[PDB]
Design a protein around this ligand. Structure first.
Ligand SMILES: O=C1N=C[C@H]2[C@@H]1[C@H](c1cccc(Cl)c1F)[C@]1(C(=O)Nc3cc(Cl)ccc31)N2CC1CC1
Length: 94
């Protein structure tokens, strides 16, 4: 469905994404998509936004992540949707 190559994509986060990334990882100008997915996953888990028991839904209406993605919640199974929400918060570099 999603190619493995997607995770090699180099990105420059927009300010609000960068702000979220900085609460879980070291700041730098450019990230891989692998890094962005890892750091956002860690952001979600540390802050207990993920309800794994009960439908694999992340609940983010009470959090900055909700502002980033424009949704009150989403399913962690919907990978293409997740990539699209992340993409709108960054600029791809070559
Ligand atoms: O399938 C999954 N089930 C749980 C994992 C993983 C999911 C995931 C992994 C690769 C690519 C995509 Cl698009 C993907 F969604 C991920 C992840 O590893 N990083 C991340 C980041 C955001 Cl913003 C949302 C969900 C996840 N989840 C973290 C759990 C704390 C919710």
């Amino acid at each position: 469905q999603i190619p493995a190559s997607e995770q090699e994509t180099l990105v420059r986060p927009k300010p609000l994404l960068l702000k979220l990334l900085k609460s879980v990882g070291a700041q730098k100008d450019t990230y891989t998509m692998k890094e962005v997915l890892f750091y956002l996953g860690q952001y979600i888990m540390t802050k207990r936004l993920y309800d794994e028991k009960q439908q694999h839904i992340v609940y983010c209406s009470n959090d900055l992540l909700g502002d980033l993605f424009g949704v009150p919640s989403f399913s962690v199974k919907e990978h293409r949707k997740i990539y699209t929400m992340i993409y709108r918060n960054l600029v791809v570099v070559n």
